[PDB]
Each structure stands twice: as C-alpha cells, then as structure tokens.
Nucleic acid binder design. Structure first.
Lengths: 227, 224, 227, 227
DNA sequence: CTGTAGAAGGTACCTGTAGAAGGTACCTGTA
DNA sequence: TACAGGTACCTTCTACAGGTACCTTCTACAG
C-alpha cells in the first residue's frame, strides 16, 4: 500500500519506528457538477453576503460564531498559537488499558501499522505483548497538524491504530430512552429466539455483500457511453 | 436522546419496531469564513469554469467522470431509478469475532419503539447468549448501506459498516513479520513493562486540549 | 560532523534511532611513494611468487595459514557463509554492567552517538539513566560487515560508543613480570613523592600539546614550495 | 610477557627504569592471498604509473601532496632532519593532571609498565603517589622512530601507559548534531528507564563474550583439513 | 440535528536520479 | 611489534524534480 505517515510509537524509553497505511478506501461514486447546456465543470466562488463582491483568499479571515450572528474573529497568529505543533512524529502512548474497557463505539478511523526502518524486532515484541496481556494502548497522535486520541490494538498479524472520539463526544448507552433494564426474559421464548437465530446463522462471506447501487450506476454509465 | 430514525428490524416473520439515536456527536470547533472589510460571512456562488456566469440550482446537472476531463451526464430520472434499487432488513447472523471493528463506520443506539419492547429484549438476550451479530441492509436518508447489530451493555448498537471491497487486507501491509521468532525473556520483559504502565480507563482524564484552548482564547478576546 | 552509520540501539522492546560520528581523525602526514626520475606515483602489481605472472583480481583466492607454508583455501561461498549478515542495523545491547568493571585498556575506537529521526526523547532518557545508575552497556555492532563488541557510556552531554577488544585479546595486569605487590611503602617517601607530583601538577591545556613533527614537516614543505 | 621497550620514566631528577609490554594482541583472522591456479602466495611489485617500470627500493622517493596531483619530493636528508632523535629511551613527563581531566576518547594504545633493573622502589612510590593523588602523568615518548603523547595511570597493581591522540585529532562532543541538553527529563520516565536498566544489569563475565566469527572460521578450516 | 455531498488547498511519502568523499576494511612489507 | 602505504568501496548527504493519496476545511441543502 501507500505509506501516509512515518514516525514512531514512543512511551518513555521505548521508541518503535512505524509506518501508517489507510485501512479503508472510499469507493463510493462521486458525481461532478456540470452546466446543463455547456457540460463544463462548476467551480466555487466566494462572495461576501454584505459587500456583494468577490473575495480573494487574502481577504478572508476566520471567525468563531459565539452566539447567533456574532463572530469573534480569530487571527491567523492566534490559530497557530493555539496549535501545539510537534517537531517529532510520534504516537506518544499515555496509557495501557484492557481491551474491553473501550467499546468500538469510540472508534473513528482505522489504520494499519507496519514496521519502520530497523524496528521489526520491537514491533513484533510489542504486538506479542499486546496480544498476551489482552490490552490496548491509549495514545495521542497527530497526522497533519491535527491532534486526536488513538488506541493501538492487534488484528491478526498486524497492529491497528484506531483514532477514537473524545470521551465527551461519545454518548451514554444508559440514557437511551425506553431501553429495558430487567432480565425477566422467559426461557421458552428465549430458546425459540435462539433457535430462530441459529436457523438464520451463516458464515461471513465478504464476497456475498456488494454495493448494488455502485454497480448499477457503473452499468448505467457504461450503457450511456457505448450508446 | 433525540430520535433521528424510526422503523423496524425485520427478518422473516420477526418485525421489531425500533428507534435510532446517534451514538456520537461532533464537538470539534468550526470556524466561519468572513470578509476582512466588514466581518460578514461569505457565501459560495456556482459559476462555470469554461465561461464565467452564475448558475441557479436548476441550471446544473450531475456527471460521472469516466476518463480525465470526460463526463457522462446522469439525468435525474435515471439517477432516481438507480437510487430506488423504513426497515433494517437482516440478511444473516454471523459470529461476533467474524467482523473486525475496522469494518465499522458509524454507531447508533437502538431503542424500543411503540409496543416493541418484549421483542427488543428477546432479540437482545438472544444476541448476547449466542454471541452473534446481525448483518443487515438499511437506509438512513436516501442512501442504502450495510450495517451490523450487536449488544453493548444493556443496549443494542447498530454499526453501519464499510463494504468488504472498501477494506484493505492486513496480509498486504508491507514489512509485517510472522509470529515465529519471539524470545521468551524479552517477551516477559515487554509484558512487565506494559503491566507497569497499565491503568484503568478514566474518560475524564482525556480531553480535547485544542478545543479548550480555543474556547479560552475566545473568552479572553471577548473580555478584551 | 559527517554521519558514518545510521541505525538504532535495541535491547528487547527498547529501540532508539541513532547516528554514529567518528570521534577522532588521523591528522598524521601521509607521504606518497614516487619514481625518483619521473616523480610519478607508484602502483602495486600483484605477481605470483611461483608462476611469476601478474594476477587479475579474479585469479586470486584467500587462504588460511593453519601451519607455516601450507594454506587451506577459503572460497567466496565459505567466507560469505561464515560472515553472518543482519537485515537490521542495530547496536544490540546484551548486557548492562557497572562503569568500573571494564577498564579503558579494552577500548579500541571511539564514536559519538547522536539522536536519530524521532529518537531524541528516548536518547535523553537512556543518557540520563546511564549517567544516574553509573553503568555502561555491552552490545554487539557491525559498521560495514565486521561484527565486533562495543560499550555505550556517557561523556559530558553525549553518548559515546566505544568498540572494545575481545576479552581473549586483552592481557592480564597480574601477569606483568616484576610488578611488586602492595608491600610496605614508606610514609615519608610517599609524602615527598606526593609533594613532587603536586609541584608538577597543572591544569590540562589541550593547546599546550601539539604534533611538532607534523608542523616541522609542513613548514619544510612550504619552504620548498616557495623556493 | 615479552618486553617490547626498555627505558625510564623521567621528569627532572626523578628517573625510574621501566619496561613496556603490549597490553593487547590482535587475534583477528588473517587470510593470505594466493594464486588460484597454483595456490602460491602473491607478492607486491612497485611499478611506476607512467613509465610502467618495476622499481627497486633505491629508485623510489617520498613525496607530500600539498595539492591534488602535485607532489613536493622530500629526500632522505630532509626527513631525517625533520625527525627528532633522542640518545636516551625515556618517557619524559611534562606535567600531571587529574584522572578525570582526560577522557578515554583520547586513548589510542595501552601498555603495561613493569619495573626495570633496580627500579622497584621508585616504581612503587610512583604508583602509590598516582593512586593517592588521583592523577595521571602526561608525557612524550618514542617507541620506534615515532614521537607521541602518552599518559601514565594506575590500573589494579600495575602502571598503564596509554599512547593518546593529539588534542587537535579529537573532535568536540559539543558539535554532535542533534544532541540536546539535560533540562527536559520526566521523572517517572527516568525511574522507569532506571528500573529497566537495573533489570538488564548483570555482572561482567569476560568468558561470555567471544569472537564468534573467528571460532566459525577456525571450525571451517578444521573441517576442510580433516576431510 | 443529522446526514450528505461537493469543491478546494496542501503536502508527505514514494518514485525516479546522480556525484562526492570519509571512513571501513583488507592486504603486503619489513626490519 | 611497529608502521606505513596502496587499493576497493559504499553509505550518507548533497543537489533534485514529478505525482498521487490522503488530510483537512468550508459551505450548502432537507425535514
């Protein structure tokens, strides 16, 4: 695959050089906007709502909307001052917690972690330690000037780094309206449900599920192209 | 807390009325572009790149780019026909460990609907006992996609997932070694290290430092 | 300085990307042999002592002299198989001993260890740990296809990696002929010797000592060059 | 042990007859180049680059390369006048500094110093004075027609004289690229690193480390011989 | 309040490429 | 043992441009 990030997993004296690859790709069809009669691509042009004039990029400033219709203009220098840029590309591990402690509810984006230069032995040691102890590593990571939380876990023979939502962005499963909390299920009905589920149970065949809409749109495009 | 979808989980004769709630919210800081002269928000005008002129939404169409610079225009009629082909239709049940969290894309809590509680708890208990997840097809808003249904705590969680062709293979990751050449003493030392840094998960410990810094700076600027 | 080796310091899970620089340079004067009448450089021509013919580098093979006058030929395959090559450039630390356990008579060559890419925090941690515990690290390294033993220690603000002689190559000071034991030493004579040493004691001035032969040769060369 | 040098440590009125012994030996495997057709050793013939004529040692003169391609020819008389000859083989001590003032990065070669004829009491007095004052003696010495700097120190019951590099041939540890200061060190991380280093700490056992390449080559030679 | 898509700027990492010299490593000779 | 001289080399940095995948942000439409 294509490497998108070069750095190291650092927690104290440990510093394992690693590389990141995107674990998923967006195959959804993107449709360009074209003029009805000219059939040319459409471009976005910035125009002020008050001065009603075209604005160059140097005439645009960023402003945080603090109440409805009122903006505190954050100067560029302020924006760079808020960012705590790091000169060292490191997935700095801040904690190690049991795997069950963090639900896949938190997970946002998945990355494949591969060994870097002169870091295969430490990579294998960390992978085996994580698999044996059955836990994951909570870390802080920056890809391109951002800053987010991540968890490192083990999937098959690879290490997977999943960025996660911050704990205050994840809602509570105990606040869901109407969810029962009493384990008063009947044994006969439960057994019938289990039998039905087992009847519907099959194996996971990834080739069985396909994007039908994508294939249909591609076939329509091919038919219109040939005709 | 706020219902965003109201339908039913359906397979065969089983039809459980359910409601969907977003399991996560985006609290990232969003900034509005403004003019420097008058500090008014800006707006986007769609103009043609071949010849500059403002176009109404009724003056534009959608075209799929098949090669570089060449598009096939999909008329709204055929686009609607393709989009045609409120229930979460379960196709089959697989094991919990058969689908990795790298498949998961979006998370939703599932709550019982009107007169749909007994079936809801029956399905939840069956899924928990059998250790299975239900693969299904569903549409949120004019976009059909694939999802799974699992049990988290005492709730049902529906995770809309990526299609299998959209997920890369862990075997294709460059340079990843095999599980054959790990020393026992080094492994024990590494395990001891990991156990030393092991701590309980404290959700209040981790916070968005950049967002708090930006909010504090905004408050200070407002005071000034 | 000029980096001469790029790799990492590895012991178990710990990996520290580092760079090697030569701590010393040979400033001695080198003289080129020239023809007396032509003043042109000379060339080494390899000629067999028996066939009395000039040999191409593909007509020459290496041989070990197990006994005087007889050689066992070690072909390319044997030498390649004996020389174990590693896929990773690592200073594999095997031991951590006390600093005083290894005498400077073991030391052979000195190298300065600088932080590598994304390897500064771990470098600082290792330096501080070595300085505080008063320990050195025994390791195996290979600069250019020649495996040897080394020790990592702390000098001032830097980490210094010294290659060392193998223990079988170092003689024992207890077997030096004629060296007396800790026999009784006269206190007055020892005090007089101490006062003499203190009288001759001065501070270390690196500029005080210089290679006088090199300066004399350079001055003679310059004098002949001028006139 | 074989005496390789016989002289006296001299400073002012103090003159201590001494003998020098090599403190280390080169046990590396050396392979003789041989002709592949007859398995006879090869020899080097000095031939001129331009004239392409075989040159006897009386037709070869030394030359210093001040610029690339141009050589100032230094005749025998010039080189003899440049070299300083001493009628007495003496290690002439110039001053004494502390043990810690000269780093082992200066050290080049090691020799054991043994008492000479009727020079045991002075040897013991010098050893005791150097040990008690914690000092080393900087000196000028010539082994065989090459004057160099040396330091005299005490190791176990012996005196060790180390030929050392000139100060201009030793690089500065403050110019190592990327080396940081000691200000930013986390205490918890430092304690973790110290605990890890103590975990890998072991007593120095010289019998554990051996030149595996030499043993492998000797085993291969023995296998080829026995067959 | 949430889902959904489109356009736009940017740059990191890989790919394809080459020259120089500084320090490694080895071999002989030679008294 | 000392001591030097010649020889093959190759690694790291210097000097180098093109291209794509992925990040990241911003607005707008729907109900």
């Amino acid at each position: 695959m294509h490497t998108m990030w070069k750095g190291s997993i650092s927690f104290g004296l440990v510093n394992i050089p690693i590389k990141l690859y995107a674990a998923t790709e967006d195959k959804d069809i993107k449709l360009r906007s074209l003029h009805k009669e000219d059939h040319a691509p459409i471009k976005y042009e910035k125009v002020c709502t008050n001065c009603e004039k075209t604005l160059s990029p140097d005439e645009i400033v960023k402003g945080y909307e603090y109440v409805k219709g009122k903006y505190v203009v954050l100067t560029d220098e302020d924006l760079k001052s808020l960012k705590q840029e790091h000169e060292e590309k490191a997935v700095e591990i801040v904690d190690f917690v049991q795997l069950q402690e963090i639900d896949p509810i938190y997970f946002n984006r998945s990355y494949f972690v591969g060994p870097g230069d002169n870091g295969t032995k430490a990579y294998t040691l960390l992978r085996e330690a994580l698999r044996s102890t059955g836990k994951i590593g909570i870390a802080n990571m920056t890809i391109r000037s951002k800053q987010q939380l991540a968890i490192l876990r083990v999937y098959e023979n690879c290490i997977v780094m999943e960025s996660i939502h911050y704990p205050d962005e994840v809602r509570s499963a105990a606040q869901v309206p109407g969810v029962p909390d009493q384990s008063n299920v009947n044994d006969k009905e439960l057994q019938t449900a289990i039998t039905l589920i087992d009847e519907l149970t099959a194996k996971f065949e990834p080739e069985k599920y396909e994007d039908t809409y994508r294939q249909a749109l591609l076939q329509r495009v091919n038919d219109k192209l040939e005709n």
